[PDB]
């Protein structure tokens, strides 16, 4: 209804570089950099994680601007993807009580997303006359299985029907999501790959948001220098918090 | 080969002037053949 | 095609645009020199009249060698070519020196030029090999008597009037013939 | 001047009316194809829009003529007045400002629609040929700018778009030689009639004869009859252009002119 | 004032009005009911879009007859007073905006200001009929 | 009515406007090997039925490898979707299958064994099909002499693939060239690609994406007939492709050959 | 899009207008009294005199009328097939003859989970494969049988058998049942539409045994559909090179298909 | 003539060679003919080159062929065989060879350092190159290492036949290498070579021709083919020459133009 | 003018018409309900036709009066104007088609042309009263 007319930073990283670059002082290093670059002490900090799914439990956005680095690895790419379509849009998520209720979709924003220790996830489709459609409503192992083991998983199901739904609430955590928009304040770089992450599961579409870059590289060091000598470039093309 | 025709070429750049106009119309009157172009030579 | 009724003398296969027109146009008029439409003393004409003298009198001539001689004297002699064609007391002249001319028959006073009458009249009618350029026949007007039998005779490149006005010893029309020699340079 | 031309075609004597930027042209924005795929993966045909005083015509293909003969797509498109004009100064500008940019056109069954991305060519051996009767008066080739028509009634603009020689790689990009198509081809005309001189009445942008008849027809709310169709839409009057209609339009221009000194 | 005078549904071309105070342009933007893979791909539903869809309107006043004395496209008048009033740096005026600023002038219009434009026009077609 | 006769077609810009389309989803098999279960079809098609969709409109072709499916793919249906097991060890097949069945090739057959032949234009391709194809060809000059082969035997020429069961060739244009295979075991068709087919859709399931349709080096186009997606559990691979099926439907159209007014087009 | 469809041609009288490839087909028995093993490049050059450049002729074998009958094959611009007379296999030459002449429309056929009608007079049912015995059953509107009991199906009423093509005509106005050897043959539901111009049918010997439709009322001989007499198989070879230019004037191109197969699948 | 000027030129809208081909031993190795560059020159004159102009070199594997580059040529199609491993390599030595060079020398035991602008990078060739750094405060002092070290240095590349070095800029740094086995050039990017394209064969095109995170600017050069044979290859290359040639151009440095104006 | 004026449905033979200047023809062919021996010949149920179905109208303007000129049939106006035109060899004017081609000139009748055709048809006459 408004009528027209014509600062904290945060790098985190995998512990394989922590290894790499073999020191315990490279802290203040890239400080004074950044201060040499024209920012003030104490303006920027960092945070490890030990592996990437690692990185999905919990995780940890708070900072005025999120670069997130991602290393290659062939046997966890559609994970990677769940972990890129969690941090890059803005998910607002309601309670599931497997146990005592039965649930549906209705949009096409309307996603389930589990997260936690560690859960497998299996489900049936519901008829109309809460009859279980090739499975049996009560029993637990008619069901059909649909994430095995899994760190974080994106389930999504076709919407109208209903889904009787299986879980280990002892072990992990459900929760039914919705989509407000993107998660501009976050932005994230892979290594290597072949642009091979996207923020749907919509097969057709599937465009780069430019907030999602790609760099080769061999060691470390020089990976963290290409990102610091930019940091400009990175803040122009995302906005800050909230 | 180039260079007996690059020789012809300083001659024929000095002949362009000790040549007559008159005579020369009055030779491009007449017509020339294979016969009168090379066998007179 | 520049004019009406394109016929495969006005394509552009191969200063403002009407001086590239003409000229694309005349370069192509330079071979009507090979195809028999002419009515007066060619350009190949006083190509082929320096060839004979330059190839007489010299030394350095060898039967080895006269091929390809005749081929780069035929190639490459003459590199400014005119050409005028008559209308109607209107006569219009263009070449690829880059300029281009219209005028009167009666009075050599210029008329400035049109290239959508001009391509049609050339490419049919007969086209006449200018030996005498625009520039001395206005001068020699100015400068020299005239009759209009002798205008005729001169747009016709009459043998009679050019050889009679080389005896005459009348300067400008031996500057332009000598100009003409010197552009036979090989 | 019009009790002039009244009193002329009572007299039979040639009758005349002057007019700055005449509005001849009936309304039609429409389009028209050559070659046709259900999807649109493979086009070659024409849009033109004549409005107002002016008209816009812009020929299109995809393939910008790599297929075709000689690399030369030719494209035709005639007018015809429905009253005859006289020592006409026509504008003739070669482009579609109208049609430059991407839209989204609908097609002709009526059930999807269609792509349109153009990017713009100039136009070579542009022929605009003002034919009277079947008879060449006007004939202009190789020329733009401001050209005149002694006596004309029909416009025929036709116009080939050539395949560039030789591109750059920016530009080889853009018409590939294989089939699949990311960009399309267009070259186009406009044509304005700024003045002129005709037989007849008629509605131009300097005048409120056609003006102030609506507004008073309107303001008296006079029901439809047979001969002004419905809502004085110009466009219907001056579709079917006959000579009752004619007469009525030279009485009613006539009495309006007439009211038009005093009425204000 | 309010009343609906002249109303008209998507006729183009040419229409009159009798008289109007306001102008209302109100138009409705549609959805594409059945579309193809060339539009389908270029109108999605995720939230960082290509493409935005728009629908213009454009008018264009031809003739037109009035009783309050406005600058028009074929006055020498306008031209005469922006003239006049530059030749020797006239002080600009305690009513008149800068530089006779035809945005500024038709910004506020007031009857005193109205009646200042009549004299001035007036004189001003007086000129013309004397020196061209 | 009037047919075969390409005649203009006026449209408009002035009216605005306010089932019997069948999918036909064919699978691998490791899929179903793991979904241990021989009611799946059943549950797809109840679910195609909520979605909208007839029961029984929906069949379930199956291919064993991706060597095998390569032969004879007549995919003959009113929509056709196709997943794909992807290979990080057989790329160029999965290519070239995309090429194939996604564009519409016009053949004409050989006889290698009598005829010379030359491709003609950059739409000019030599599919070969069938059982274990083994091409032997050997270009010539323009009075047929051997280049890099002998011609007064078979064994000596160049070869371009070997244990392939289909392979598109496309060969310099404008020269003759002499030709073996075994006509036994596999057949090989001089195919003109007259345009681009939009009966099917071919997905893939697994790593990167490598499709490309255009032989040409330059133009490695993206088409959106083309489309990739992750998985770890072919389950919520097929779930997804129904929970979408309505923009695929949407994305492809009508194949422009059987419409009742292609007649007298290249096949109705 | 439709090619235009609804936007009718303009034509007039006053105005004064004044590579491709051809195959052959040939049955085994020309193989065998040929006796050459470089005729087939003979044939080439000849086609080249009478217009045809070098490379736009190729050729094809079959052994049998029967075998030849199953899953048919076209593969040039212009298709033309040379039938060998015989007396105890005329329905099959004229089935084959209906099929590549005229164009075909099907659906798949089943016997599985429903029955089946023809919705009109001018549908048809075809079976192909290597082993096709048809039996078939109309019923009432009690969906009960009428000379075949609905349950037991060897006094059925069979139409088909020992055979490998066929193309049968039941009786509009009841729903059927049939005994198809199901994995040993298989059957389709066509519609033929019109006449197609793709191919053409030289029959050496024998007295017009065709009929390319079953109505009694209407045996249409076509122009396409051409008789010679032969004892030597190169003359019939020569004597067809010598009008090829009349075969080519009978037929049109403007109607081939894409794939090989003479009609066209849409389930 | 008129060089060393910028002397705007105006316009209007109205108006030998050498193929050059480069490959790896394992194919020709694959090939077991030896008379096959003859067959293919054959090729090519077929589709207009003239006999005896068209010259094809030899490297026995990437490193190798990444270690004193040398294209002069008139058109250089480059083929590169794809391997999971050099990713970085094949891009950087796609760089070298995509880009023009204005470089410098440098004495590392004598001086600083610095990039002044984003168009500045450090590049390295060698047998056995591998290089350290240590960035210095404003002060002229070490940080995480100390110039009178060599061994607390930060460790940026490791025996790679070649790097293109980059650091944050503005700031000094003392480095280490080794000067008799290996030469550091410091470069500036200008603009992009027409002389060269780049055709990889087996892989997904990861080119990335900027040390620029935030785009991988793609271009009409870096091509991309599959294989199971290498004459397939070839006959790929030679056949489809035409729209390459359209896409690299004259080498805008050769002309006799840009004379005195950083002319190679 | 946009409007229908008179009808004749299942009339034949002669008739009137007061005013008009378009004629439109719907007709309708009818297949026979029932064929004897004769006709299933003529019409196979089947694709495959031999002999074609036809209706046809023939229409004749005896005679009329018209608003503007032209020729006939029972007068000899245009005879007598392209013999003099002929005769002399007079170059072709701008306006007139040339040899007075009657069906040219009627493809393109503008009111010019008309105008001079009577004219040129009143000067016919006059002379046709003299030496006939």
Known sequence: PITGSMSTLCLYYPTEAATEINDNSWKDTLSQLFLTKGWPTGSVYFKEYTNIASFSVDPQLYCDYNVVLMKYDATLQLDMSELADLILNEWLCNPMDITLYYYQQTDEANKWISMGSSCTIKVCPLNTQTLGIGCLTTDATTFEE????????????????????????????????????????????????????????????????????????????????????????????????? | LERQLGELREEFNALSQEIAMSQLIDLALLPLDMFSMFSGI | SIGSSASAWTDVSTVSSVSTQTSTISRRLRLKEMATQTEGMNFDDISAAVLKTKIDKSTQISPNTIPDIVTEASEKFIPNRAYRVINND??????????????????????????????????????????????TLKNLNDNYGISRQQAFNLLRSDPRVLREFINQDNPIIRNRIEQLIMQCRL | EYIENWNLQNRRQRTGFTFHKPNIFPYSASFTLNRSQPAHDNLMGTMWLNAGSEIQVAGFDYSCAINAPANIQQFEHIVPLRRVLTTATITLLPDAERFSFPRVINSADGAT??????????????????????????????????????????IRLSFQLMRPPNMTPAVAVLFPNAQPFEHHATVGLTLRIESAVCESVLADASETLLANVTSVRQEYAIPVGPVFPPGMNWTDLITNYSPSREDNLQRVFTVASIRSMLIK
Not at chain 1, 165 to 184: F, S, W
Not at chain 4, 126 to 150: C, D, K, P, S, W
């Open chain 1, 146 to 242: 649909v994430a095995t083991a899994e760190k974080l998983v994106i389930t999504d199901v076709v919407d109208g029907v209903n889904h009787k739904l299986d879980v280990t609430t002892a072990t992990c955590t459900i929760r039914n999501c919705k989509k407000l928009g993107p998660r501009e304040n976050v932005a994230v770089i892979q290594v290597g790959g072949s642009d091979i992450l996207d923020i749907t599961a919509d097969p057709t579409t599937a465009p780069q948001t430019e907030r999602m870059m790609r760099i080769n590289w061999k060691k470390w060091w020089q990976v963290f220098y290409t990102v610091v000598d930019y940091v400009d470039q990175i803040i122009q093309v995302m906005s800050k918090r909230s």
């Open chain 3, 90 to 135: 209107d006569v219009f002249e263009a070449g690829i020196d880059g300029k281009f001319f219209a005028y009167k028959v009666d009075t050599f006073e210029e008329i400035p030029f049109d290239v959508q009458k001009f391509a049609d009249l050339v490419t049919d009618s007969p086209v006449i090999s200018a030996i005498i350029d625009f520039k």
């Open chain 4, 113 to 154: 629609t269609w792509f349109f991305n153009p990017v713009i060519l100039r136009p070579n051996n542009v022929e605009v040929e003002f034919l009277l009767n079947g008879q060449i008066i006007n004939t202009y080739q190789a020329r733009f700018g401001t050209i005149v028509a002694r006596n004309f009634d029909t």
